Every structure is written in C-alpha cells, then in structure tokens.
C-alpha cells in the first residue's frame, strides 16, 4: 500500500531533480511532471508565498526540518492539504545546500 | 500537532539516520533516541523476523513501497500496531540504495 507521503528532491528554486514514486498515490502527479518544474507552480496561488517564505526559512535553518502546511494541486486540478517537511541537505564540502529534500505528507 | 505517522529514514540494518519530528506523537520516542538504534530492537520479538524479511523484500523491490504491520514499542514500553511503509530510495547515479524510507503509520 502506497502511503500519502513522498520525497520531493528539488533545488532552491523549486525545480525537482528527483521525484518519489508515491507522488502518484499522494497527488496523482507523475514524477516526470515535477521534473524541471517548480513546486510553486502546482501550489495554491494564495499560499504560494507561504511556501516560498518557508522555503527560504528552511535554507536559513539548514538541516532543520520545517514542515509547512499548504494546499497542493492534484492531477484532478483540486487543492489538497499537504504538509511538506522540508529538509535542507548540506554538502560536507563547504556546507552548501545542493538541494532541499521536502517530505510531502498529505494531511487532507 | 502532528499525526501518528512519520518518515523513518534509516539504513538496511534499521539504524535510524534521520527521523521527522512526528515520532513523538506516534511512539513518544525522541528522534535522537532512534538515531544509532535498530528498529528491530524496539520491535516486537514475534514480529522481528517479520520486519527483517520485509527489509530484504523492499531491497529486492527497489523503488517500491512495502507496508508491513507489526507491533512497535513506545516510550511507555507498550506494544502498538504500526504499519511501516518501507520505500527503497534508488540513487540515480549507479542505482545504489542510499537509505530506506519507512513511513511508520500507527494503526493500533
């Protein structure tokens, strides 16, 4: 059984580099759909800033998992409540964040 | 304010590498308590091999999720039914398993 939770590997811009397989069970969106696209493009317009603010926040946090709750757009074009536990991945080289590992868990 | 479900990112041996801040409401065990510990240690004896085989199963799957229902020990040392959805993350480099994403969903 595929749970309503998936890992969203994307850079600071929101461009996904690697999408989970459980995304289709969560929002119904195919991994290939998120690839090259911004997560903000599939987020509730009035909650887009909420995502961005929290995104920049998790970058400043660095390593601190910040779960932001917002409404994401499904393949049905609907808006579901998802809690994205964003985890900034720091590289051991110079402590640079290569990408943000967002744990997208559907709540509603 | 989090549900009885959390993403348990750990290695094949069960050693928790990264645990979301949801385990507190699920089992009471703090993330730091799980870090460096085997999930099988806090697992019900009669369900240890169950989880063990499931771990090997998810490795054979690769990129697939395997939901196993066993009894996990809480901070109260009580046995609760947990539906651990193990997902094997495949690194897009040489297809190496970086870690196992075990979405622990408490049922009973």
Curated annotation (Swiss-Prot), chains A, B:
Domain PAC: 67-108
Disulfide bond entries: none
Signal peptide residue numbers: none
Ranges where the PAS domain occurs: 1-62
Subcellular localization(s) per the UniProt record: Nucleus
Purpose: Required for activity of the AHR. Upon ligand binding, AHR translocates into the nucleus, where it heterodimerizes with ARNT and induces transcription by binding to xenobiotic response elements (XRE). Not required for the ligand-binding subunit to translocate from the cytosol to the nucleus after ligand binding. The complex initiates transcription of genes involved in the regulation of a variety of biological processes, including angiogenesis, hematopoiesis, drug and lipid metabolism, cell motility and immune modulation.
Quaternary context: Monomer. Homodimer only upon binding to a DNA. Efficient DNA binding requires dimerization with another bHLH protein. Interacts with TACC3. Interacts with HIF1A, EPAS1, NPAS1 and NPAS3; forms a heterodimer that binds core DNA sequence 5'-TACGTG-3' within the hypoxia response element (HRE) of target gene promoters. Forms a heterodimer with AHRR, as well as with other bHLH proteins. Interacts with NOCA7. Interacts with TACC3.
Protein name: Aryl hydrocarbon receptor nuclear translocator
Gene: ARNT
Shown segment, full-protein numbering: 358 to 465 of 789
